[PDB]
Amino acid sequence: IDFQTETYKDAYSRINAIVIEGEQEAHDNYLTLAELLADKKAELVGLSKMENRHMKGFQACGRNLKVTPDMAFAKQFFSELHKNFQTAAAQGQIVTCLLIQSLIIECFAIAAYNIYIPVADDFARKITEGVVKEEYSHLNFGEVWLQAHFEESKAELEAANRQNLPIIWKLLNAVADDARVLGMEKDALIEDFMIAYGEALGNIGFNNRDIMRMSAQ
């Protein structure tokens, strides 16, 4: 892969902006969760601080390839997930907030970052490797909490999945062209998100039929 073509820098302007905006949103979402879940404030504040470090690392990736991120593009990209998290937070829907951030968004990131790693430039590869090592703890936080509250959370989890999983599939379809320019196959991204997200639903307490039913939305 040639990291200095106009085609690569163009695609990267949007992808790098998307990760940066995603990291900033995760930082904000974990702080919002620290107010809704007072009991886990220290944990959630620590997760927010990892997200700041991720955001800084991906800013540095962009400057390494001399690419100015298209931050407007990114903000548009996340607007529906952002709006949904906020509407949930505004009503005290902790379970919906956890499903959007800790499960769906972290699964999306884990899938994507692991596909990027073997096609990234050396500097971005090292950064991304450290980020993805941390994103497993984010996912596990949500899995542990929702597992411990499963029966009481189950209905809300199903409704939040119906509402937000279709949003993530649009994002996945929308990024695919630029992701291909970077060397990332779309089918691998779809498959890896569905594996990661199904396994997360399994850990929280959904049976295999329910996972298949939910994966269908």
Ligand SMILES: [Fe+3]
């Ligand atoms: Fe992150």
Ligand SMILES: [Fe+3]
């Ligand atoms: Fe995260």
